[PDB]
Amino acid sequence: PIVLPFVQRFNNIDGFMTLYVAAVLIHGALFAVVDMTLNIYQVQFSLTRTEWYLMDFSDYIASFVVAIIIAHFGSKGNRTRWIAASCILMGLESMLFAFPFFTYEIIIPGRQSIELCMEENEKRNIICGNSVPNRSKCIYFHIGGQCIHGIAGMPIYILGITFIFDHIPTSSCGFYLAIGHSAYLIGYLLGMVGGLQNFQPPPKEKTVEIEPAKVYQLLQSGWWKTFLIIAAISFCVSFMMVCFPTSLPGAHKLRLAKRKEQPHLKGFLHNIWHILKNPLMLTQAICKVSEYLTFNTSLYFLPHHLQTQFLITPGIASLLTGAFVLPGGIIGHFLGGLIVDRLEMTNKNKLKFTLVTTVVSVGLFLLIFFVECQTTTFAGINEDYDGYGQLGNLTADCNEYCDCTTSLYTSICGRDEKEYFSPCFAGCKATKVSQTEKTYYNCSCIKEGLAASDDEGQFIDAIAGTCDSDCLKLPLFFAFYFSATVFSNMCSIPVISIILQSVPANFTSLSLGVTYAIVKFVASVPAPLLFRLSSAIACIYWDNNRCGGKERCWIYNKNILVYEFMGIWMSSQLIIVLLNIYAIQIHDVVVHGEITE
Numbered sequence: 001p002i003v004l005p006f007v008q009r010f011n012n013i014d015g016f017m018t019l020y021v022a023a024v025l026i027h028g029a030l031f032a033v034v035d036m037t038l039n040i041y042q043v044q045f046s047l048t049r050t051e052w053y054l055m056d057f058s059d060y061i062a063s064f065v066v067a068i069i070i071a072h073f074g075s076k077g078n079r080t081r082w083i084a085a086s087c088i089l090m091g092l093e094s095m096l097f098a099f100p101f102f103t104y105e106i107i108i109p110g111r112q113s114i115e116l117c118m119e120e121n122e123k124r125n126i127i128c129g130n131s132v133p134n135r136s137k138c139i140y141f142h143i144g145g146q147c148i149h150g151i152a153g154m155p156i157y158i159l160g161i162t163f164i165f166d167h168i169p170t171s172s173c174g175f176y177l178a179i180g181h182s183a184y185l186i187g188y189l190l191g192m193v194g195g196l197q198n199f200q201p202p203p204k205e206k207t208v209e210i211e212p213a214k215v216y217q218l219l220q221s222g223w224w225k226t227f228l229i230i231a232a233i234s235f236c237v238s239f240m241m242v243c244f245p246t247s248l249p250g251a252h253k254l255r256l257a258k259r260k261e262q263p264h265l266k267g268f269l270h271n272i273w274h275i276l277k278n279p280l281m282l283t284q285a286i287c288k289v290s291e292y293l294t295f296n297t298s299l300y301f302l303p304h305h306l307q308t309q310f311l312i313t314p315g316i317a318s319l320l321t322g323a324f325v326l327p328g329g330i331i332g333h334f335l336g337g338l339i340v341d342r343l344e345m346t347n348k349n350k351l352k353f354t355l356v357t358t359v360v361s362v363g364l365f366l367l368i369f370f371v372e373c374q375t376t377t378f379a380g381i382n383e384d385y386d387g388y389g390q391l392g393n394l395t396a397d398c399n400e401y402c403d404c405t406t407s408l409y410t411s412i413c414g415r416d417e418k419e420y421f422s423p424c425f426a427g428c429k430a431t432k433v434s435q436t437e438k439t440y441y442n443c444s445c446i447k448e449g450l451a452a453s454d455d456e457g458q459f460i461d462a463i464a465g466t467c468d469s470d471c472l473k474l475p476l477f478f479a480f481y482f483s484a485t486v487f488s489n490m491c492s493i494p495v496i497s498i499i500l501q502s503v504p505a506n507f508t509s510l511s512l513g514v515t516y517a518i519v520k521f522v523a524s525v526p527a528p529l530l531f532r533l534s535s536a537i538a539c540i541y542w543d544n545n546r547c548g549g550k551e552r553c554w555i556y557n558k559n560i561l562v563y564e565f566m567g568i569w570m571s572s573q574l575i576i577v578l579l580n581i582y583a584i585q586i587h588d589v590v591v592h593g594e595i596t597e
C-alpha cells in the first residue's frame with residue numbers, strides 16, 4: 001500500500017539515476033581502497049610480487065566472465081532486479097575481503113608469533129616464517145574477494161547505463177554518462193583519500209620499533225572498519241532498488257511518446273557478425289584500447305616516475321597522481337559530455353570533435369616529453385662510492401652493526417649535497433628523532449662532507465630522506481599533465497556516445513557487453529606483461545646481492561624510462577589518430593550509402 005508521492009517521484013528517470021550513482025559511488029569507493037589494500041597486503045604480509053598481480057587479475061577476469069553472460073541475461077529479464085542483486089553481491093564481497101584482516105591479524109607482527117620469535121633476540125624476531133601459513137589461507141579470502149568483486153561489479157556498470165540508454169533520451173544520456181563515470185572517479189579519490197589517512201601512520205611515525213608492531217594493528221583494523229561500513233551500504237542501496245518498479249512508470253510515459261509517430265545463439269551471432277561487418281564499432285573499440293592503455297599506464301608509471309626523476313617519496317608520489325588526475329578527469333566528462341548534450345551533436349560532428357581533442361592532447365604529452373629533457377639534481381648512482389667501494393660496497397661494516405636491510409633502503413642527504421642511500425648505512429650510530437623530522441647522528445660511513453651543517457640540542461648530523469634543490473619543474477609537469485587528462489576524459493564521451501546510435505533499441509543492452517569484453521581481456525591482460533618487461537628495461541640495476549629474483553631495483557633508468565614509456569604513449573596515442581581517420585572516411589562512405597542524395 002505504498003502509494004505515497006515519494007515512490008512516484010522515486011520511480012523518476014532520475015530516481016534510477018539517484019540510486020545508480022549511489023550504487024556507483026560506493027562501488028568507486030570500494031575498488032580504490034582495494035588496490036592499495038592488495039598492494040600493502042603483498043609487502044606487509046610476506047608475499048612476492050608474483051601473487052599480487054594474480055589477486056589483481058582476479059577482479060579483471062571476474063568482470064570478463066560476466067561482462068558477456070549478464071549482458072545476455074540483462075537482455076531477457078528485469079534490469080532493475082539484476083543490478084540490485086549485483087549490488088547485493090557487493091555487500092557480501094566487501095565484508096568478506098575484511099574477514100581475513102580481523103581473523104588473521106596474527107600473520108606477521110614483529111613479535112606476536114610468540115612460539116618462535118623471542119622478545120630479546122633480534123634475528124629470531126625476523127625469521128621462522130610462520131606468516132606464510134595463514135597467508136595463503138587469506139589469499140583464498142582475497143582471490144574470492146577479488147572475484148566476487150568483478151563478477152558482481154561489472155553488471156552494475158552495464159545494466160544501469162543500459163537503463164540510461166533505453167529509458168533516457170539521447171540529448172541527456174551524456175549528461176548521465178558523465179556523472180556515472182565521475183562517480184567512479186570520485187570514489188577513486190576518496191578510496192585513497194579517506195582510506196590512507198588511517199593507513200598513513202598516526203602522529204607517531206617516529207617511536208621505537210613498537211610502531212611497526214602498532215602500525216600493523218591499524219591497517220587490518222583500518223580496512224576491517226572501512227569495509228564493514230562499505231559492504232552494508234551496498235546492501236541498503238540494493239534493497240532500495242529492489243523496491244523500485246519492474247515496469248518503470250517514467251519510461252512507459254516516454255515509451256508511448258516514442259511508440260507513436262529470442263536471444264538465441266544464431267541471433268546472438270547475428271549481433272556478433274554485424275559488429276565486424278560495421279567498421280564503425282571496429283574503430284570505436286580499438287580507439288578505447290589506446291585510451292585505457294595510455295591512461296592506466298600513467299596512473300601507475302607516474303608515481304614511479306615522480307619517485308625516480310623528481311625523487312618523491314613512493315607513498316607521497318602515489319598521492320600526487322591520485323589527488324591530481326581526478327580534477328582533470330571529472331570535468332573532462334562533465335565539460336566533454338555537455339558539449340554533445342547541449343549541442344545535440346551528430347555522428348559526423350563527434351568524429352571531428354574526437355580528432356582535434358586527441359591531437360592537441362598528444363602534443364601536450366609531447367610537451368611533457370620536451371620538459372623531461374631539462375636536467376635535474378642527481379643523488380647516488382655516481383659509480384663506485386667516491387672510489388671507496390663499488391656499487392654494492394653498500395654492505396660495509398656500518399651495514400652490519402645497525403642491521404641495515406637492502407630492501408627498505410632510502411636515500412639520505414649529507415651536507416656535501418651528495419645523496420647517500422640507506423640512512424643507517426651512512427654509518428649513523430645514533431639517531432635522535434624530533435616531532436616533525438627524522439635525523440641521524442654519528443654518521444661514520446659519511447665522507448668528509450659536512451661544510452657548515454647545523455643543529456641545536458646536538459651539533460652536526462645528517463637529515464633523513466632525499467634533499468631536493470630544483471623540484472620547481474614539478475608545477476610545469478602537472479600543469480601539462482592536467483590538460484592531457486582533461487582531453488582524455490572528453491575523448492571517452494564521444495566514443496561511447498556514438499555506440500548507442502548505430503544499434504537498434506532492443507540490441508543496445510548487448511552493446512555495452514561487446515565493448516566491455518575487450519576492456520579486461522584484450523587490454524588489461526597483456527598490459528602488465530608489456531609494462532613488466534619494459535619496467536625492468538629501465539630497472540636493470542636490480543639488487544642482485546640480496547633480493548634474488550628481481551624484487552627491488554635501485555636504478556630506474558631516468559633517461560630510458562622517459563623515452564620508453566612516453567614514446568610508447570606516443571605510439572599508443574597515434575593509433576587513435578589512424579583508427580579515427582579510418583573511421584571518419586568509412587563513416588562518411590556508409591552515411592553516403594544511406595544518404596545518396
Ligand SMILES: *[C@@H]1O[C@H](CO)[C@@H](O[C@@H]2O[C@H](CO)[C@@H](O)[C@H](O)[C@H]2NC(C)=O)[C@H](O)[C@H]1NC(C)=O
Pocket residue numbers: 429430441442
Ligand atoms: C656518538 O654520539 C654521542 C652523542 O651523540 C657521543 O657521546 C659521547 O660518548 C662517549 C662514549 O665513549 C662518552 O664518553 C662521552 O661523554 C659522550 N659525549 C657527551 C657529550 O656526552 C659519542 O662520542 C659519539 N661516538 C663517537 C665514536 O664519537
